[PDB]
Design an enzyme around this catalytic site. Structure first.
Site, PDB file in Angstrom:
ATOM      1  N   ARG A   1     -13.481  11.478  -0.347  1.00  0.00           N
ATOM      2  CA  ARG A   1     -13.593  12.922  -0.538  1.00  0.00           C
ATOM      3  C   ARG A   1     -15.028  13.399  -0.328  1.00  0.00           C
ATOM      4  NH1 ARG A   1     -11.723  13.020  -5.760  1.00  0.00           N
ATOM      5  NH2 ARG A   1      -9.918  11.992  -4.749  1.00  0.00           N
TER       6      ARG A   1
ATOM      7  N   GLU B   1       0.319  -3.331   4.791  1.00  0.00           N
ATOM      8  CA  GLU B   1      -0.759  -2.371   4.981  1.00  0.00           C
ATOM      9  C   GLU B   1      -0.784  -1.870   6.421  1.00  0.00           C
ATOM     10  OE1 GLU B   1      -2.980  -0.388   4.211  1.00  0.00           O
ATOM     11  OE2 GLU B   1      -4.076  -0.899   2.368  1.00  0.00           O
ATOM     12  N   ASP B   2      -1.314  -0.651   6.593  1.00  0.00           N
ATOM     13  CA  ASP B   2      -1.537  -0.051   7.904  1.00  0.00           C
ATOM     14  C   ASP B   2      -3.014   0.066   8.265  1.00  0.00           C
ATOM     15  OD1 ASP B   2      -1.920   1.999   5.945  1.00  0.00           O
ATOM     16  OD2 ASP B   2      -2.000   3.477   7.563  1.00  0.00           O
TER      17      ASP B   2
ATOM     18  N   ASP C   1       0.849  -1.174   0.000  1.00  0.00           N
ATOM     19  CA  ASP C   1       0.000   0.000   0.000  1.00  0.00           C
ATOM     20  C   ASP C   1       0.890   1.231   0.000  1.00  0.00           C
ATOM     21  OD1 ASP C   1      -2.231   1.731   0.068  1.00  0.00           O
ATOM     22  OD2 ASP C   1      -2.301   1.694   2.240  1.00  0.00           O
ATOM     23  N   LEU C   2       0.310   2.352  -0.386  1.00  0.00           N
ATOM     24  CA  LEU C   2       1.069   3.596  -0.420  1.00  0.00           C
ATOM     25  C   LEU C   2       0.878   4.313   0.914  1.00  0.00           C
ATOM     26  CD1 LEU C   2       2.591   5.863  -1.303  1.00  0.00           C
ATOM     27  CD2 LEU C   2       1.259   6.234  -3.253  1.00  0.00           C
ATOM     28  N   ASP C   3      -0.335   4.807   1.136  1.00  0.00           N
ATOM     29  CA  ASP C   3      -0.626   5.698   2.244  1.00  0.00           C
ATOM     30  C   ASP C   3      -0.509   4.934   3.559  1.00  0.00           C
ATOM     31  OD1 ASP C   3      -1.671   8.247   3.371  1.00  0.00           O
ATOM     32  OD2 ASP C   3      -3.419   7.017   3.859  1.00  0.00           O
TER      33      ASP C   3
ATOM     34  N   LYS D   1      -5.411   7.493  -6.957  1.00  0.00           N
ATOM     35  CA  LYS D   1      -5.102   7.817  -8.349  1.00  0.00           C
ATOM     36  C   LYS D   1      -3.802   8.599  -8.463  1.00  0.00           C
ATOM     37  CE  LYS D   1      -8.375   9.442 -11.101  1.00  0.00           C
ATOM     38  NZ  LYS D   1      -8.891  10.817 -11.403  1.00  0.00           N
ATOM     39  N   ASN D   2      -3.252   9.064  -7.336  1.00  0.00           N
ATOM     40  CA  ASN D   2      -2.011   9.824  -7.318  1.00  0.00           C
ATOM     41  C   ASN D   2      -0.794   8.940  -7.059  1.00  0.00           C
ATOM     42  OD1 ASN D   2      -3.264  12.565  -7.506  1.00  0.00           O
ATOM     43  ND2 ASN D   2      -4.150  11.916  -5.538  1.00  0.00           N
TER      44      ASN D   2
ATOM     45  N   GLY E   1      -8.348   9.444   5.649  1.00  0.00           N
ATOM     46  CA  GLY E   1      -8.659   8.129   5.158  1.00  0.00           C
ATOM     47  C   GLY E   1     -10.084   7.969   4.692  1.00  0.00           C
TER      48      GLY E   1
ATOM     49  N   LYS F   1     -11.058  -1.727  -1.226  1.00  0.00           N
ATOM     50  CA  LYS F   1     -10.825  -2.367   0.075  1.00  0.00           C
ATOM     51  C   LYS F   1     -12.059  -2.187   0.990  1.00  0.00           C
ATOM     52  CE  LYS F   1      -5.835  -1.245  -0.719  1.00  0.00           C
ATOM     53  NZ  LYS F   1      -4.639  -0.356  -0.535  1.00  0.00           N
TER      54      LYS F   1
ATOM     55  N   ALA G   1      -5.203   2.615  -3.433  1.00  0.00           N
ATOM     56  CA  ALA G   1      -6.439   3.175  -3.973  1.00  0.00           C
ATOM     57  C   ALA G   1      -6.212   4.528  -4.632  1.00  0.00           C
ATOM     58  CB  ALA G   1      -7.503   3.284  -2.876  1.00  0.00           C
TER      59      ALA G   1
END
Ligand SMILES: [Ca+2]
Ligand SMILES: [Ca+2]
Ligand SMILES: [Ca+2]
Ligand SMILES: [Ca+2]
EC number: 5.4.2.6
Length: 224
Positions: A49, A169-170, A8-10, A117-118, A46, A145, A115
């Site tokens: 938007r 993952e976090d 995962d990124l974030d 798009k960035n 998290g 997710k 997840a």
């Protein structure tokens, strides 16, 4: 031996929490709404938007049309996408860069299962694109997710079975998605948040190639 690590990124590679908070605060002042402070921001993190914008509206019971709502959500996103121009390699969480080097030099596949798009842009801002064999496109994946599809697509994009894969993952929803994909989750965080059942480390500095091999070998013994 595992053949791929699915990131995962974030919350694993980095976070952009200050950028989100700045963008939300700018949006709320533009529409003359007050009370988007750091404690209130804890509710936005998290969260999608649209739901975060609704929470900001309820602060003033402001009602808007669907076109205005969609316009406000885009305005915050365009502003945030401008703010993350300033992300740099110094934002990579501890332990992560060395882990990516060790996997690459060990010829273990590295894939992003995020997840956002960035994701491609943020990895380029952090000078990490060279390490990533694939990035699963979240737009191409309908179910998010805790559904396992993003992780399934990540494993497939690098040609390994999820059962040959470790996922990092976090978040609880991400941990569950890794589980349901068949890959092996290693959480970073607290068991109060992530569960008492999985392997967990308190922070990313524990994410070492040697520790993942320990978790992998120990999973292979569990038969039986
Ligand atoms: Ca996460
Ligand atoms: Ca965190
Ligand atoms: Ca770095
Ligand atoms: Ca760069």
């Amino acid at each position: 031996m595992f053949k791929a690590v699915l990131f995962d990124l974030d919350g694993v590679i980095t976070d952009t929490a200050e950028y989100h908070f700045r963008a939300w605060k700018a949006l709320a002042e533009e529409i003359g709404i007050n009370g988007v402070d750091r404690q209130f921001n804890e509710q936005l993190k998290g969260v999608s938007r649209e739901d975060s914008l609704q929470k900001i509206l309820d602060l003033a019971d402001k009602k808007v049309s669907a076109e205005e709502f969609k316009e406000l959500a885009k305005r915050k996103n365009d502003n945030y996408v401008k703010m993350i121009q300033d992300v740099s390699p110094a934002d990579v969480y501890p332990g992560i860069l060395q882990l990516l080097k060790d996997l690459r030099s060990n010829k273990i596949k590295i894939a992003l299962a995020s997840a956002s798009k960035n994701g491609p842009f943020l990895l380029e801002r952090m000078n990490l694109t060279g390490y990533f064999d694939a990035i699963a496109d979240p737009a191409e994946v309908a179910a998010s997710k805790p559904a396992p599809d993003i992780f399934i697509a990540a494993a497939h994009a690098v040609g390994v079975a999820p059962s040959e894969s470790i996922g990092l993952e976090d978040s609880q929803a991400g941990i569950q998605a890794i589980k349901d994909s068949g890959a092996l989750p290693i959480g970073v965080g607290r068991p109060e948040d992530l569960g008492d059942d999985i392997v967990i480390v308190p922070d990313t500095s524990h994410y070492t190639l040697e520790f993942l091999k320990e978790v992998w070998l120990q999973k292979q013994k569990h038969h039986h």
